[PDB]
């Protein structure tokens, strides 16, 4: 019901502005323990010999690796994605060139997506980068995904109650609330802002006075847009385990420069990255997945901020395997 002190507090603004993080030490410790399960990098191996483009039959993304390097990637992918089932989660055990199991074809696309994040979206992931583990955390289905309607629990490894299930209509408002940090905002910010690039998050004027021609009647955006933006911000705050002041001086949410932190610009790039992942890599996978993986509108599961971040301002507290697995990007 309450959280016992001490609280951990940081400062993100000029003294006297009450800007900063507010953290519960036991909560931070528990997330650190969970994130520390990240398997360590595999031992380095032989860099010389022919490329597997020559050695194997059906290697389309990782063709420039040596055999030892390529089998190291396969070992790593297995631990990160399908450790309980092993190689045969994706492979026909009698023919490793076979693409007959749906996870194989998905994993090839995922290799391309991972390389794209680490190559094309350094404005977000920097030199920390992502691996399969960042999202998957040891299971074929990542624990935090989104459909085109809100779903509970947020962590799909938990069993839902009857009222949490998406088919139970009476539970809708709670499904929405638990995605916007318990607010009553009547908007799903995943489908509005993160599934694609159709909407503008910004709602605040950049002039003192109302501009003639955009400020009256149907010229205007409805006030609903401002509630939806607040819902997205509530959801992002909770996804990172943080508050508005990590990114903004609330004096003026719409101002950059001294009124925004460096982390806000990183967040902006994160929105763009997530939209690219969803539109171009994840949504098209509905054609490759079984019916049982799809939502009620035939959609594949997609990513939001929580998919990687899982309640921390940096996924896995900034742990990295980038230099350990150069084949996941950045690709030259």
């Amino acid at each position: 019901c309450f959280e016992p002190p001490p609280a951990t507090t940081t400062q993100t603004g000029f003294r006297g502005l009450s800007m900063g993080e507010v953290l519960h030490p036991a909560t931070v410790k528990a997330k650190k323990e969970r994130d520390a399960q990240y398997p360590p990098a595999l031992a380095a191996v032989k860099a010389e010999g022919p490329p597997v483009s020559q050695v194997y039959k059906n290697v389309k993304v990782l063709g420039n690796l040596t055999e030892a390097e390529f089998l190291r990637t396969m070992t790593a992918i297995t631990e990160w994605v399908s450790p309980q089932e092993g190689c045969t989660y994706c492979h026909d055990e009698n023919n490793l060139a076979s693409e007959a199991k749906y996870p194989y074809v998905v994993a090839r696309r995922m290799l391309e997506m991972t390389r794209a994040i680490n190559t094309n979206w350094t404005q977000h992931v920097a030199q920390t980068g992502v691996t399969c583990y960042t999202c998957h955390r040891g299971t074929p289905l990542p624990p935090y995904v989104r459909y085109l309607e809100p779903t509970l629990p947020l962590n799909n490894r938990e069993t839902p109650t009857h009222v949490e299930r998406v088919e139970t209509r009476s539970g809708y408002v709670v499904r929405l609330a638990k995605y916007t940090a318990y607010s009553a905002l009547n908007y799903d910010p995943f489908t509005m802002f993160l599934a694609n690039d159709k909407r503008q998050v910004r709602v605040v004027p950049q002039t003192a006075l109302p501009l003639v021609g955009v400020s009256r009647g149907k010229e205007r955006r409805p006030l609903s847009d401002a509630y939806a933006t607040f819902a997205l911000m509530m959801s992002i705050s909770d996804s990172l385990g943080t508050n508005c002041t990590f990114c903004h001086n609330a004096q003026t949410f719409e101002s950059w420069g001294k009124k925004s932190t460096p982390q806000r610009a990183i967040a902006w790039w994160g929105i763009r990255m997530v939209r690219d992942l969803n539109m171009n890599y994840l949504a098209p996978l509905n054609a490759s997945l079984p019916a049982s993986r799809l939502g009620r509108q035939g959609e594949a599961p997609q990513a939001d901020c929580r998919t990687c971040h899982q309640g921390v301002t940096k996924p896995l507290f900034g742990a990295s395997r980038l230099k350990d697995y150069p084949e996941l990007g950045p690709i030259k």
């Binding site: 002039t207 003192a208 006075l209 109302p210 501009l211 003639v212 400020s215």
Partner: protein, 243 residues
Amino acid sequence: MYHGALAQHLDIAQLVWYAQWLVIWTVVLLYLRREDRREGYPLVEELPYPKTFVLPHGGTVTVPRRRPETRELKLAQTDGFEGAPLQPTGNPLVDAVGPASYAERAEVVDATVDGKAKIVPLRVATDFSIAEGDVDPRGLPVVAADGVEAGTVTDLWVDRSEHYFRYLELSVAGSARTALIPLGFCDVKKDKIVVTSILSEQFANVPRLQSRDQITLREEDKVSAYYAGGLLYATPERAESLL
């Protein structure tokens, strides 16, 4: 173009801001602060035109009151600075100075909406009673600040307009008289009424009513003021610093 924009770097909200402050300062300084001066002026040692009220039971009053008579104050200056405090020259309780002071209210009985005496003992207000659950103080002793019994409660005086008790009346031991005390100066217990504002002996000089079963507005003031005086004057120590 912009909605609200005027010639210069002026805009409509900007002009409204000046207006709002002008209104507020006008209301405060030219209206409210003038209403504040309808009592106590002219000052001793910008004014509004007098205000007349038509009274509920006939007649009018114009405020501030000008009284055809003037009371003598038994006070001596303690020193000669403009703002030095004054000091009693007799018994301040009986002389009614300082916190024992009363106002020259009308010598008329406060009335109910129907024209009856408003504040009356229960011996008169025979339709009134004490709520079940509360102490009936009649017949209980009154114990003064010195722990000495000053007398015995004889009646309660009720406000017939608000249905609320305002005074107790007690017989004053040894003095062949009764006295009123406002209930605000009474700690009502099951076995006694405790009064810490005055000492037992000081009950003998409580202002007397002209009539046994009614009280004037001025008499109410004289009665209440006497006990308040005790807070400062019941003993010599009460005027000195607490610490």
